[PDB]
Amino acid sequence: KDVTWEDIANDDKTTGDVLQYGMGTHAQRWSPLKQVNADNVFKLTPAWSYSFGDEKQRGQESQAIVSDGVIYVTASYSRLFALDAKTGKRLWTYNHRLPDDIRPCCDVVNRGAAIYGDKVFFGTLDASVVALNKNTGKVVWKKKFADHGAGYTMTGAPTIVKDGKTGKVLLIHGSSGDEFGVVGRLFARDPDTGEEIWMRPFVEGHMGRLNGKDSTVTGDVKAPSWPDDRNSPTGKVESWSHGGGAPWQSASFDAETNTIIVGAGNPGPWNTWARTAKGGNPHDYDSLYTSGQVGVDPSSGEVKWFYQHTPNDAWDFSGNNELVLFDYKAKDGKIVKATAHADRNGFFYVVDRSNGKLQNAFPFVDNITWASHIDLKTGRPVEREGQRPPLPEPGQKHGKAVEVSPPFLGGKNWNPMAYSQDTGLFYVPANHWKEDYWTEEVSYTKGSAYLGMGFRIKRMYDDHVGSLRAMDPVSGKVVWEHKEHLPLWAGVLATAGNLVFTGTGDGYFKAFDAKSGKELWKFQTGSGIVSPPITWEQDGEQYLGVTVGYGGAVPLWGGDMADLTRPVAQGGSFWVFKLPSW
Amino acid sequence: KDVTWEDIANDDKTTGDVLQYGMGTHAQRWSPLKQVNADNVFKLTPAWSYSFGDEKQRGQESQAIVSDGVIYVTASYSRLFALDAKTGKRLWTYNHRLPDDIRPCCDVVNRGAAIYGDKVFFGTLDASVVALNKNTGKVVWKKKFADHGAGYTMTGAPTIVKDGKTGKVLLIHGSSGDEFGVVGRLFARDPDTGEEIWMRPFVEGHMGRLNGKDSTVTGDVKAPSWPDDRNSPTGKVESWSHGGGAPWQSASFDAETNTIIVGAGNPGPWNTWARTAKGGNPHDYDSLYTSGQVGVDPSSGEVKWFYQHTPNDAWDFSGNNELVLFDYKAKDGKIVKATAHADRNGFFYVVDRSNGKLQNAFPFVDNITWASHIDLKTGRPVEREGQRPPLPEPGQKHGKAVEVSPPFLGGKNWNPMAYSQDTGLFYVPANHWKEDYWTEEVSYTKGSAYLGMGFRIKRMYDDHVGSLRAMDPVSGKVVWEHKEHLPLWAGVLATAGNLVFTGTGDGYFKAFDAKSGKELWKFQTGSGIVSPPITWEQDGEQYLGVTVGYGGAVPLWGGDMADLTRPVAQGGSFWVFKLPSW
Ligand SMILES: O=C(O)c1cc(C(=O)O)c2c(n1)C(=O)C(=O)c1cc(C(=O)O)[nH]c1-2
Ligand SMILES: O=C(O)c1cc(C(=O)O)c2c(n1)C(=O)C(=O)c1cc(C(=O)O)[nH]c1-2
Ligand SMILES: [Ca+2]
Ligand SMILES: [Ca+2]
Ligand SMILES: [Ca+2]
Ligand SMILES: [Ca+2]
Structure with a gap:
């Protein structure tokens, strides 16, 4: 029974393995393990450490996968290490030869x-x-799906899913490069051959694939949501061919409706005026299928439903953060089968997963300015006046700067949130900070960045940046807050030991009490932590795993925040923790 | 009063700090701490780690030093780190700018x-x-003392001395570069200005310096132990200008007699025939002042005594391993104030530190082929029949191969031994291995290696390479042995808790019982260990620390042992360990 569909399907229930990004199909990042709990945490101890070496460091975002005592882990610069769960012995490794003309936007990371x-x-x-x-390090198949030289990469974990209709098992993966003006795409493949079953673009009017040849087209062909141009070949504006919406994070899956649930990324170029008719109003010029959660049909790759989070993303509020399936108990009576999401744009969304109908929406980060709230009968944010920054004055190649929050790095970025089955709360790794944003000149050039705006990131508050927050999904309340001097960039894990775990920027692995927020235990690993920890049972013992090595976007795009973070050291290791056997 | 001569001189007794390589002026690597002992050692646990980062790894050979609350540690590629001893937080760093064309022989390392x-x-x-x-890392002075383009480097820890006659405090340091054809030199400098006080060459007939001016000649001016050459501009064979005997490790210091006691390295080139008169006998052409232990006068830089380990070192048995100072209780009767040494050539020596005379010699490794024993009245090896390899028969471009043991890597390399004041034993980090050796052509070429020989290192035994042995210095017996699969290439620490500590090439920091040799405790750190561990007490707690990150000579010169070692991961980091508070 070596890794079957049901092992995967049952994966949040079986404490002795971890088979995918999220610790379940619902991606709850939850475990029923209680060997480690709030009265004995003080004793947790490192069991062993493995270094990745090769003189190759940079950000380490990977969530590890354990199956029958082998940790499978990914490292920067496209490597994969297979390790003995109990000792930290190395079993095998794979190194990908990387061309010299790669261009990942936000560091050479890999997520699982x-x-x-x-x-x-x-x-x-x-x-x-x-x-x-899984036993040898032997390559079985390889497929290269896109031109890297034009801006594509891949940084996110792939997932496995079973078509409840056709019976087939698929491999689901996404793509990356909104910043390079790529057309984002979603894919399905055959596990044993890596042959393309289906391909689906996420900018409106683009041509999708099915069993090898073209199939259908995402929405209307005329593409009413993007501005037309009766001079270019397509009739549409240039941005239309460089649209974006890349799903650079991972899917989630619901067996009960036979639906893939995945996020779409920000549209290209950053600038709202490249995607609005001259003259014109950026209000209903939505850049259809970008910066929202998409429901997908497993059998054909056609779009089932879609809930957009930033109708005309002027700010690079990439709206593809993860979707956790929970049972929403409205506010009185009706349990609703829902999606939960803590977006880049500062708000928390409760979406009906049966059809993408908004149920609750509310802020999770303090002083928001681009929008006052989300108008519930309409599913649309109610914006503020100068928040789409104005075009330059005649003669100026830079326009007027406006102070926005949150910044493009967001309220929360890819690092992921956990759901607690016992307390009902979502534990969100958020940050508090803002920026100056201003318009510049916009034009596409293959292999070049395609923003069209200028920016600077800066503090919001004097005493902190990172904000561990316990949010109640029905009332929209902050049950508790843990604050940190550096930003927060690691995933969170929740357990039936009444514990919350995460790592910080200055290198500690920490444990928090899940009802009150009190700091109970920490350990200094030696580099900032930017991954999601996991836990598991092994020959009767509870284990914790965290990947260590600072990186990601802050160092390269953080502004003031790059400066704060200059003294953090690089690294590259995996660490396993447990209770002393003696 | 911050770190005075009296702090340094009582350095072996103060459990509170660590001020120099060897944990005292006698280099014993002995601690009277007993908090951690043979009965409680199985609870020892990591306290914190620090990652060196910079994407700069390779071999990490440093001995940390401690005082007030701060750890000063050295890293690969010339870098110095000051770390808070309780927390591991970084206080400051100093990265030296290196040129692109340095040429260390045996990895980019530093010892303290x-x-x-x-x-x-x-x-x-x-x-x-x-x-x-000390308080920040600003540079006070810095002295480039030789030319790196011609092959000089530095790898060994400097040390501090007080000349008893003059009252002056000196900084003592050696040089490195025998494989590139250098004149090995020892230097004494003023601690506050950097100013050369004296410079002494360890090749016979070369000129010294005292107060910036030429002083005296080492030994006899005519250098009779080096072959003559009418028709040469110096009067001597070419190799006398490139003769070696560099003091690449560190001094020991005896205040009772006012003597600086150090090792001198191997002669250059390896080829015995370039240091023998055409058609003469390698015997008595000694290659004076190479591969032995030197007693030197701190006042003038002059040589007081010399004891040769290998007289015409044909094997690169670099004769400068550490010298420990101890009291030798003869065999029966006498207490001799002695030197203790475990040579690369595989013989342990015991010598009288007042006059350089041989008291005893026996083999600490098992299958020595180059010499039968050390003749106690003569002081000389009794060499075997064809163990200096023969020249190429006329027309050949390499001579025939002979089997030698130990090989140039040694019975013991730099990785120092330790002494127990309780048990009386030496704990040596030895290896069993051997090689095929043969002759090539020899020619000097500035900035390029000067061997004149071919070689191939090979195992001796199928079940182990590394051999951790407890040696009795009065009878010559191996009282206990512990065997390891890979080479042994770290230092040893000895304590009053009945314990000896060391690190292995597969990444374990280990504890053995000192009286019987049993392995009591082990922790997997992530990469191979090649540094000497220390210990110190702070706020009633006993800390252990160790530098981690595999490297050194094996992965480059090792041959079959370069291939055994291939899958051991690089790293770079410091680790501190302690007993659990509860
Ligand atoms: O839209 C994109 O196509 C794209 C890709 C990724 C990435 O692939 O990691 C980043 C982003 N977006 C991005 O906006 C960004 O702020 C982000 C930060 C991180 C990181 O790993 O820390 N990845 C990315
Ligand atoms: O003769 C020299 O001048 C020289 C220096 C060093 C060095 O400086 O590291 C090595 C050697 N010798 C040496 O023989 C060699 O066996 C060696 C091993 C190592 C080590 O760090 O791994 N260095 C040295
Ligand atoms: Ca599982
Ligand atoms: Ca983006
Ligand atoms: Ca001391
Ligand atoms: Ca040498």
């Missing part, structure tokens, strides 16, 4: 692998997907 | 800093000595 049958899977920075035998 | 007054001191890879303010 998937296991199915006897194979291990992961995406690579030159835009490929590789399959390896 | 020294300390005196308000200053820290260390050698750099472009052959310089640097002085840093």
Whole structure:
């Protein structure tokens, strides 16, 4: 029974393995383990550490995968290490040869692998997907799906899913490069051959694929949501061919409706005026299928439903953060099967997963300015006056700067949130900060960044940046807050030991009490932590795993925040923690 | 009063700080701490780690030093780190700018800093000595003492001395470069200005310096132990200008007699025939002042005595391993104030530190092929029949191969031994291995290696390479042995808790019982360990620390042992360990 569909399907229930990004199909980041709890945490201790070496460091975002005592882990610069759960012995490794003309936007990171049958899977920075035998380090198949030289890569974990209609098992993966003016795409593949079953673009009017040849087209062909141009070949504006909406994070899956649930990324160029008719109003010129959660049909890759989070993303509020399936108990009576999401744009969304109908929406980060709230009968944010920054005055190649919050780095970025089955709360790794944003000149050039805006990131408050927050999904309340001097960039994990775990920027692994927020335990690993920890049972013992090594976007795009973070050291390791055997 | 001569001189007794390489002027690597002992050692646990980062890894050989609350540690590629001893937080860093064309022979490593007054001191890879303010890392002075382009470097810890006659405090340091054809030199400098007080060459007939002016000649001017050459401009064979005997490790210091006791390295080239008269006998052409232990006068830099380990070192048995100072209770009767040494050539020596006379010699490794024993009245090896390899028969471009053991890597390399004041034993980090050796052509070419020989290192035994042995210095017996699969390439620490500590090439920091040799405790750190561990007490707690990050000579010169070692991960980091509070 070596990695079957039901092992995957049951994966949030079985404490002795971890088979995918999220610790379940619902991506709840929850575990029923209680060996480690709030009265004995004070004793947690490192069991062993593995260093990735090779003189290759930079950000380490990977969530590890454990199956039958082998941790499968990914490292920067497209590597995969297979390790003995109990000792930290190395079993095998794979190194991808990386061309010299790669261009990932926000550091050479990788977020995980998937296991199915006897194979291990992961995406690579030159835009490929590789399959390896879980026992050997032997490559079984490789497919390169896009031109890296034009801006594509892959940084996110792939997932496995089963079509409840056709019976087939699929490998689901996304793509990356909104910043480079790429057309984002979603894909399905055959696990044993890596052959393209289906391909689906997420900018409105683009041509999708099915069993090898073209199929249908995403929405209307005329593409009413993007501005027309009766001079260019397409009739549409240039941005239309460089639109964006790339799903650079991972899917989530619901067996009960036979639906894939995935986020779409920000549209291209950043500038709202490249995607609005001259003269014109950026209010209903939505850049259809960008910066929202998309419901997808497993059998054909056609769009089932869609709930957009920033109708005309002027700010790069990339709206593809993760979707956790929970049971929403309205506010009195009706349990609703829902999606939950803590977006880049500062608000928390409760969406009906049966059809993408908004149920509750509210802020999770303090002083928001681009929007006052989300108008519930309409599903649309109610913006503020100067928040789409104005075009330059005649003669100026830069326009007037406006103070926005949150900044493009967001209220929360990809690092992921956990759901607690016992307390009902979502534990969100958020940040408090803002920026100056201003318009510049916009034009597309293959292999170049395609923003069209200028920016600077800066503090919001004097005493802190990172904000661990316990949010109640029905009332929209902050049950508790833990504050930190550096930003927060690690995932969170919740357990039936009444514990919350995460890592910080200055290198500690920490444990928090899940009802009150009190700091109970920390350990200094030696580099800032930017990944999601996991936990598991092994031959009767509770284990914790965290990947260590600072990186990601802050160092390269953070502004003041790059400066704060200059003294954090680089690293590259995996660490396993547990209770002393003696 | 911050770090005075009296702090340094009582350095072996003060459990509170660590001020120099060897944890005392006698280099014993002995601690009277007993908090951690043979009955409670199984609870020892990591306290914190620090990552060196910079994407700069390779071999990490440093001995940390401690005082007030701060750890000063050295890293690969010339870098110095000051760390808070309780927390591991970084206080300051100093990165030396290195040129692109340095040429260390045996990896980019450093063995430690020294300390005196308000200053820290260390050698750099472009052959310089640097002085840093202790409280911050600003540079006070820095002296480039030789040319790196011609092959000089520095890798060994400097040390601090007080000349008893003159009252003056000196900074003592050596040089490195025997494989490139250099004149090995020892230097004494003023601690506050960096100013050369004296310079002594360890090749016979070369000129010294005293107060910036030429002083005296080492030994006889005519250098009779080096072959003559009418028709040469110097009067001597070419190799006398490139003769070696560099003091690449560190001094020991005896205040009772006022003597600086150090090792001199191997002669250059390895080829015995370039240091023998055409058609003469390698015997008595000695290659004076190479591969032995030297007693030197701190006042003038002059040689007081010399004991040769290998007289015409044909094997690169670099004869400068550490010298420990101890009291030798003869065999029966006498207490001799002695030197203790475990040579690269595989013989342990015991010598009288007042006059350089041989008291005893026996083998600490098992299958020595180059010499039968050491003749106790003569002081000389009794060499075997064809163990200096023969020249190429006329027309050949390499001579025939002979099997030698130990090989140039040694029975013991630099990785120092330790002594137990309780048990009376030496704990040596030895290895069993051997090689095929043969002759090639020899020619000097500035900035390029000067061997004149071919070689191939090979295992001796199928079940183990590394051999951790407890040696009795009065009878010559191996009282206990512990065996390891990979080479042994770290230092040893000995304590009053009945314990000896060391690190292995597969990444374990280990504890053994000192009286019987049993492994009691082990922790997996992530990469191979190649540094000497220390210990110190702070706020009633006993800390252990160790530098981690595999490297050194094996992965480059090791041959079959370069391939055994291939899958051991690089790293770079410091680790501190302690007993659990509860
Ligand atoms: O739209 C994109 O196509 C794209 C890709 C990624 C990435 O692939 O990691 C980043 C982003 N977006 C992005 O906006 C960004 O702020 C972000 C930060 C991180 C990071 O790993 O810390 N990844 C990315
Ligand atoms: O003769 C020299 O001048 C020289 C220096 C060093 C060095 O400086 O590290 C090595 C050697 N010798 C040496 O023989 C060699 O065996 C060696 C091993 C190592 C080590 O760090 O791994 N260095 C040295
Ligand atoms: Ca599971
Ligand atoms: Ca983006
Ligand atoms: Ca001391
Ligand atoms: Ca040498």
